[PDB]
């Protein structure tokens, strides 16, 4: 019936190819009757830095600042900064989290890295126990929709950049799998800037068309073998 979707979106420009991918996702999921929420990081001027400002009140140890320990305690004592808890609420309510971003240095743009660093704290996303298959967000789906400057050719095992699955590893496995997400196959839109309209539209349509049956999909086996083998 009614699945809830959070789109975490990281692009500066509404007219961008990333913006269109985000908008057709909102459009198509909305059409299906899904509950949809968008975190527009640049528009929110989202704070990427992990600092002691992320804890309100009294630090667990104001002499030596340990971010990980202090945020773990602030979570369990409900004293995290509100920009963080706002995002955790959106994530708690979502059944599927889509990340929409241009590839920046084989990874996410820093503003989105900061979202991962600050929002996915211990207590909330992971714990002992509860990581990988049993991470605290199990039951949820996650999907990386990434756009690139480099063509698909460049992202082959014999290409200069190596297989795109190589750079996926820290995101899909080290971050998403670690928190208990089932990981849906990445959506990779290769090299929009150098493409035609026929190809570009094609890529947007693939995405829109894929979203039509997203709820029927099987997760990938988020394994070293999936990423590095064959």
Ligand X SMILES: Brc1c(Br)c(Br)c2[nH]cnc2c1Br
Residues that constitute the known binding site for Zn(2+): 173, 177, 222
Q: Is 113 in the site for a copy of itself (CB under 8 A)?
A: yes
| Residues from 154 through 183 that contact Zn ion (CB under 5 A) | 173, 177
Ranges of beta strands (E only) in the chain are 4-9, 35-40, 96-102, 141-148, 182-183, 187-190
β 96-102/4-9 pair status: parallel
Count Cβ atoms below 10 Å from residue 141 Cβ, excluding itself. Answer: 21
Minimum CB–partner distance for residue 223 and Zn ion (Å): 6
Q: Is 138 in the site for ligand X (CB under 6 A)?
A: no
> What are the structure tokens assigned to 110, written together?
């820093």
> What are the structure tokens assigned to 58, written together?
């009294």
Among ligand X, ligand FAD, a copy of itself, none, the one that 153 touches (CB under a kind-dependent 5 to 8 A) is none
Q: For residue 178, which of 145, 140, 208 has the smallest C-alpha distance?
A: 140
| Residues from 186 through 205 that contact ligand FAD (CB under 6 A) | 192-193, 197, 200-201, 204
Distance CA 226, CA 230 (A): 8
Q: Is 105 in the site for ligand X (CB under 6 A)?
A: yes
Q: Is 65 in the site for a copy of itself (CB under 8 A)?
A: yes
Q: Is 169 in the site for a copy of itself (CB under 8 A)?
A: yes
Binding mask 83-112 for a copy of itself (x = CB under 8 A): ---------------------xxxxxxxx-
Contacts of 122 (CB under 8 A, 6+ apart): 68, 71, 72, 75
| Residues from 74 through 133 that contact ligand FAD (CB under 6 A) | 102-106, 117
Which of 32, 35, 60, 67 is the binder for ligand FAD (CB under 6 A)? 67
* DSSP helix/strand/coil, 229: coil
Which of 6, 9, 10, 20 is the binder for ligand FAD (CB under 6 A)? 20
DSSP codes, 85-149: HHHHHHHHH-SEEEEEEE-BTTB--HHHHHHHHHHS-BTTTB-SS--GGG-TTTT-EEEEEEEES
Instruction: Give one word for 185, left, alpha or beta, with left for phi > 0 and alpha for psi -120 to 50.
Output: beta
Whose CB is nearest to ligand X? 149
- For a copy of itself, the binding residues (CB under 8 A) are 12-13, 15-16, 42, 45, 48-52, 63-68, 104-111, 113-114, 116-118, 120, 132, 149, 157, 160-162, 166-167, 169-171, 173-175, 178, 224, 227-228
- For ligand FAD, the binding residues (CB under 6 A) are 11, 13, 16-18, 20, 50, 64, 66-68, 102-106, 117, 147-150, 174, 192-193, 197, 200-201, 204
């Amino acid at each position: 019936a009614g699945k809830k979707v959070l789109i975490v979106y990281a692009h500066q420009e509404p007219k961008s190819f990333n913006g269109s991918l985000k908008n057709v996702a909102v459009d198509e999921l909305s059409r299906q009757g899904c509950t949809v929420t968008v975190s527009d990081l640049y528009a929110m001027n989202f704070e990427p830095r992990a600092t002691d400002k992320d804890i309100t009140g009294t630090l667990s140890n104001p002499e030596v600042f340990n971010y990980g320990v202090e945020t773990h305690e602030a979570y369990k004592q409900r004293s995290l900064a509100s920009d963080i808890t706002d995002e955790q609420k959106k994530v708690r309510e979502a059944d599927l989290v889509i990340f929409q971003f241009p590839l920046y240095w084989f990874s996410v743009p820093a503003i989105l890295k900061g979202w991962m660093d600050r929002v996915l704290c211990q207590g909330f996303a992971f714990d002992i126990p509860g990581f990988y298959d049993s991470g605290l967000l199990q039951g949820k789906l996650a999907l990386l929709s990434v756009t690139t400057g480099g063509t698909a050719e460049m992202y082959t095992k014999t290409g200069v950049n190596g297989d795109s699955r190589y750079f996926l590893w820290p995101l899909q496995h080290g971050t998403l799998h670690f928190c208990g997400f089932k990981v849906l196959a990445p959506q990779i839109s290769f090299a929009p800037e150098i493409a035609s309209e026929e190809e570009r539209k094609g890529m947007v349509a693939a995405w829109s068309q894929r979203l039509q049956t997203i709820w029927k999909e099987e997760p990938i086996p988020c394994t070293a073998h999936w990423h590095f083998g064959q």
